[PDB]
Paper text:
The [name]-48 carbapenemase is widely disseminated in Enterobacterales, necessitating new treatments for producer strains. [name]-48 is a class D SBL that uses a nucleophilic serine (Ser70) to hydrolyse β-lactams, with a proximal post-translationally carbamylated lysine (Lys73) proposed to act as the general base for both the acylation and deacylation steps of the reaction. Diazabicyclooctane (DBO) inhibitors, including avibactam and nacubactam, act on a wide range of enzymes to overcome β-lactamase-mediated resistance.
To investigate the possibility that the differences between avibactam and nacubactam binding affect the dynamic behaviour of [name]-48, molecular mechanics molecular dynamics (MM MD) was used to simulate uncomplexed, avibactam- and nacubactam-bound [name]-48. In contrast, such differences are less prominent when the avibactam-bound structure is compared with that of uncomplexed [name]-48, although the Arg214 RMSF increases slightly in the former. In contrast, in the avibactam-bound or uncomplexed structures the t-rotamer is preferred. Val120, the other residue contributing to the [name]-48 deacylating water channel, consistently adopts the t-rotamer, as observed in the crystal structures, in all simulations of the uncomplexed and DBO-bound enzyme.
Author numbering:
A (entry chain B), B (entry chain A): 21 to 265
């Protein structure tokens, strides 16, 4: 009979067409079945990089470090390389622009003891925060696979994580990335550059009228020129599978 | 001193271009200033029609008539003219497709006494539910102006309505209409055909990185042929005012 995870290597053509390598993992929530081009890489655990802004936001909100999605975290005045970071932000825009320094401040206020307790409660990856409390998701010990991202995201979708329903609703609002009359995408990008292998991530889900498709993808990212392929390759897979037009 | 409300008749060109008549009202939240092509019509009261699905959703959620945005409202098996109504719905899809029969059932469960009490607590329009308990927003005594729609929507945006924060967050989720890297629109269409003057509505807001623009428009709508002009004319005004690209 059928397997929980089916391997579809035809999606490799989307990576090869773009001279790239990686994995797309999909989970059909109604069917309770998943699909991927590479079962091994789907289960390979990597640094989460800015995809960690999902659990970091949940923890900050539940502890009151972030009061709500409108609270302003003023720019500290240091001019950084990414121009969108050199301004005031709230939770919505800090997630949209992947504003690392805002989330580093959240992490310092959370502190290592509460951060570790929460990640254990979340069953998140290898639950390892070794390194600096304000950078472990970039260059410390935490590792999470694409299938583990999906497991975590499904809990968040269903408000089943061990934080309040309010915290989960606010983070799902902040994850809003695209919406039209055909679908809604709630998702978070990531770009791991500090420790090899350099990779890009996109994790989240596609809401349809009558089903939800969870997704997690990562791909080799030797330079920043390929960052747009995170969404583009995912959408090519979604289009091939008739999930989006 | 500066003016809270300013009339801009140049927006009438967007109505004339489409052989139409109506009013667009905008509110710049940061500046606390409003703008409209027709101050008189902006303040005249009309049937809300399906824009009433906003308060109706809030009341149904707060009373527990609707448990959450996933609860299924099974199709009653009666084939109606609008094809998307002839299927099961949840709160998200019932809003999206403006599924009147689902909301008529909500209104019957809410009942006259609680519906009236809630509309008074919301300061919603003339607060008058005279007429049939399950159609008064289509052919009863309730009336609301475009400026009153904005005032109600601003309360919803700020979680200031008397119902729970949870109920307000769920309805704002269900109002999601469009989202991209430039803006998020949360809104509700309406179409009042049962009592003259027949009009179309679009009410909601545009979320930017650092501001929110509330909007409420109504326009003469003698047939369904022009329904798309509700969004099209609003977007022409938003583009003219540099709110969206
Ligand atoms: Cl949302």
């Amino acid at each position: 009979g059928p397997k929980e995870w089916q391997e579809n290597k035809s999606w490799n053509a989307h990576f090869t067409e773009h001279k790239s390598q990686g994995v797309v993992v999909l989970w059909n929530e109604n069917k309770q079945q998943g699909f991927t081009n590479n079962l091994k890489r789907a289960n390979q655990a990597f640094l989460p990089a800015s995809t960690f802004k999902i659990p970091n936001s949940l923890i900050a909100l539940d502890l009151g470090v972030v009061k709500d999605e409108h609270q302003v975290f003023k720019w500290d005045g240091q001019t950084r390389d990414i121009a969108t970071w050199n301004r005031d932000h709230n939770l919505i825009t800090a997630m949209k622009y992947s504003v690392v320094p805002v989330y580093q401040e959240f992490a310092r206020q959370i502190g290592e003891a509460r951060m570790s307790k929460m990640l254990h409660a979340f069953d998140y990856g290898n639950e390892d925060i070794s390194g600096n409390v304000d950078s472990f998701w970039l260059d410390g010990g935490i590792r999470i696979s694409a299938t583990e991202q999906i497991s975590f995201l499904r809990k968040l979708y269903h408000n089943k994580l061990h934080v309040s329903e309010r915290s989960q609703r606010i983070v799902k609002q902040a994850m809003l990335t695209e919406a039209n009359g055909d679908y809604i995408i709630r998702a978070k990008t990531g770009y791991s550059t500090r420790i090899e292998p350099k990779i890009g991530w996109w994790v989240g889900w596609v809401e349809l009228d009558d089903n939800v498709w969870f997704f997690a993808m990562n791909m080799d990212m030797p330079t920043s020129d390929g960052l747009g392929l995170r969404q583009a390759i995912t959408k090519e897979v979604l289009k091939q599978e008739k999930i989006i037009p």
